Design a protein around this ligand. Structure first.
Ligand SMILES: *[C@@H]1O[C@H](CO)[C@@H](O[C@@H]2O[C@H](CO)[C@@H](O)[C@H](O)[C@H]2NC(C)=O)[C@H](O)[C@H]1NC(C)=O
Ligand SMILES: *[C@@H]1O[C@H](CO)[C@@H](O[C@@H]2O[C@H](CO)[C@@H](O)[C@H](O)[C@H]2NC(C)=O)[C@H](O)[C@H]1NC(C)=O
Ligand SMILES: *[C@@H]1O[C@H](CO)[C@@H](O)[C@H](O)[C@H]1NC(C)=O
Ligand SMILES: *[C@@H]1O[C@H](CO)[C@@H](O)[C@H](O)[C@H]1NC(C)=O
Ligand SMILES: *[C@@H]1O[C@H](CO)[C@@H](O)[C@H](O)[C@H]1NC(C)=O
Ligand SMILES: *[C@@H]1O[C@H](CO)[C@@H](O)[C@H](O)[C@H]1NC(C)=O
Lengths: 172, 106, 49, 172, 172
């Protein structure tokens, strides 16, 4: 993907994350656990639904048209009728092929984006209290219990509370 | 003494392969089919008014070939001509048959 | 039964934008294409362990 | 947007910025002020103009064609003429719809990009003298008067000049 | 490009890099040297080849069609035959124009992406042992001989080995 997160610096996805599309796993003094991030899951899904609504959209309505099957050889005028239909089908076939390929490239890129946005939002929250370990994981340089982890996921983690402790651990 | 916080995304046991701009087969978690390839096999009689021609072509019902007398004054949204139709009156031909059948049908 | 789109093979649903059933149609029909399948991704890259 | 800046980590736009598309607002010992960034404004605009020139481009010229309105019922040949025109109009209608939707997605993404490029160029300039506060703002850990702010916007800010002072403030 | 690396924070390309599309140049106690990065070069190329295979793909096969050149004035039916062909050619001309323009925009963006991915992978490897100098270059704050540089390119550089030394140099 164009951001390098999914199938990039995050080695692989999590089959055990069954209640969201993106999320956090943590390790701390009390153990390990997981949680979905709703707002990024919803972002990816909303975009994808936007794209579905545009495509699953009302088919045109046509009634009487030209004929497209013929029981007798007639020559010039039937040549035309066939060429007309064959030309339309090829054009529409091309459109459908291109559409699906563009959308799919964009779908894979936008979901990559969201993963990357969530990571960056997290990196920003932690300030000087953590280092990026390169695989999508943050080493956090202070005691960080389940509530603390919870505040990181809520967006109410106050880095100044932990700053003297983390800076001390980071630089020795 | 510290913690580790890991960022990630889901995967599924059964991915499906799709086509992209740069990749002929790449695996995503889900996809949906955009080409209808099956039919129930029947013509539905709603919401369009279907008129089954049974043994009759439109032109025969027009002229009033005796076995087609049941079609007198009928209306239709879609007139269905069957392959088993047959003529059973005076042998005739229509110059630009296709055009007559078209304009009546329309 | 009820269906907006008719083909000589029978009626077809019209939830999808394209169809491979018959170039001949009547009503509100998906557009006819040569492909028998086109899958539109609706999720991210599947990347298992 | 695909980078997460506009309508992302920057809460909202500035109606008061009337002389550029992107810019800086600062707070320091002398007060607060604003300034547009010309080079990123010009980047967004140039791309958008490129895209306009491609689209507003010379229409094709057609002369004698087929007829498209008919006063008498004729059958087979008029069926064809109508089907031909109806097929072209639908194809062109589709093209126009797709074009506008692709371009618009790309326009929103490229302008997002520029905002994000400007931010990153700034983060790089400041080195160890500032921290990203998460909302598009840099906390600068040294006295930074109007000229100093000016040098950050000119691209001639010399971080080594302020480094001992900032490092001292950042780590305590 | 949409990431800002090529023709952005990297001033210019290297004509001397003749064995890869992306790579490293280093300066250290033993001198200066260069090396290609194979895995990012291959990523860009693979994508581009994917896109070529989709396009250079089997042309359709048509046989008997309509006529397209005419030696006598005939009126209505020839008007139609010409209009049909002229309509198809314009539609295909449009498709080809759009295709090439979309692909090219995406090709320039994906190669930009790869350059940027490689940089970020590197930044992550070095942790607290280096600072980004803004022009695509990392200042490394420890003695880093040819093997050390080699380990950075292999992906087996162990930042903890150099950490006390770098932190000491960085903060003074
Ligand atoms: C595969 O993708 C489709 C489209 O996003 C999903 O189908 C939708 O699911 C919702 C919620 O359960 C339904 O209410 C909709 O009616 C479905 N939409 C369509 C287009 O059918 C579905 O979630 C995915 N399939 C699996 C197994 O996850
Ligand atoms: C709908 O009907 C058409 C025509 O009756 C079917 O197309 C035929 O497909 C078979 C087998 O693939 C070919 O041997 C015939 O030559 C085709 N006929 C024509 C005129 O194209 C088609 O299979 C039917 N569609 C479905 C899905 O039932
Ligand atoms: C989430 O935020 C709420 C509201 O501020 C707070 O009460 C709670 O402690 C946070 N969650 C956790 C698990 O700490
Ligand atoms: C149609 O034709 C066949 C042969 O004449 C006959 O047996 C059948 O009854 C006819 N069908 C109807 C419904 O009139
Ligand atoms: C901008 O750069 C110029 C030229 O180097 C310099 O004279 C000036 O001090 C800078 N601007 C401000 C407001 O400091
Ligand atoms: C590259 O990695 C290999 C295998 O671990 C190692 O032997 C070598 O030292 C590294 N390359 C350099 C130039 O140091």
């Amino acid at each position: 993907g164009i951001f390098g997160a999914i199938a990039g610096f995050i080695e692989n996805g999590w089959e055990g994350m069954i209640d969201g599309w993106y999320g956090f796993r943590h390790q701390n003094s009390e153990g390990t656990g997981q949680a979905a991030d709703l707002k990024s899951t919803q972002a990816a899904i909303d975009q994808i639904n936007g794209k579905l609504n545009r495509v699953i959209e009302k088919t045109n309505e046509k009634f009487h048209q030209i004929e497209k099957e013929f029981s007798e050889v007639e020559g010039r005028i039937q040549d035309l009728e066939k060429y007309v239909e064959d030309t339309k089908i090829d054009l529409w076939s091309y459109n459908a092929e291109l559409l699906v390929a563009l959308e799919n490239q964009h779908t894979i890129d936008l979901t990559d984006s969201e993963m990357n946005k969530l990571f960056e939002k997290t990196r920003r929250q932690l300030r000087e209290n953590a280092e990026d370990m390169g695989n999508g994981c943050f080493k956090i340089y202070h005691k960080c219990d389940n509530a603390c982890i919870g505040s990181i996921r809520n967006g109410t983690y106050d880095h100044d509370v932990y700053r003297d402790e983390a800076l001390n651990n980071r630089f020795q | 003494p510290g913690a580790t916080l890991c960022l990630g995304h889901h995967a599924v046991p059964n991915g499906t392969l799709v086509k992209t701009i740069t990749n002929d087969q790449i695996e995503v978690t889900n996809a949906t089919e955009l080409v209808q390839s099956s039919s129930t096999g029947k013509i539905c009689n709603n919401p369009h008014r279907i008129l089954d021609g049974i043994n009759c072509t439109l032109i025969d019902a027009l002229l009033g070939d005796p076995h087609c007398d049941g079609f007198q004054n009928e209306k239709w949204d879609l007139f269905v001509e069957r392959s088993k139709a047959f003529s059973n009156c005076y042998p005739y031909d229509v110059p630009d048959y296709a055009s007559l059948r078209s304009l009546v049908a329309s | 039964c009820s269906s907006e789109c008719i083909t000589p093979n029978g009626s077809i649903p019209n939830d999808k934008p394209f169809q491979n059933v018959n170039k001949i149609t009547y009503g509100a029909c998906p557009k006819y294409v040569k492909q028998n399948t086109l899958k539109l991704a609706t999720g991210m890259r599947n990347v298992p362990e």
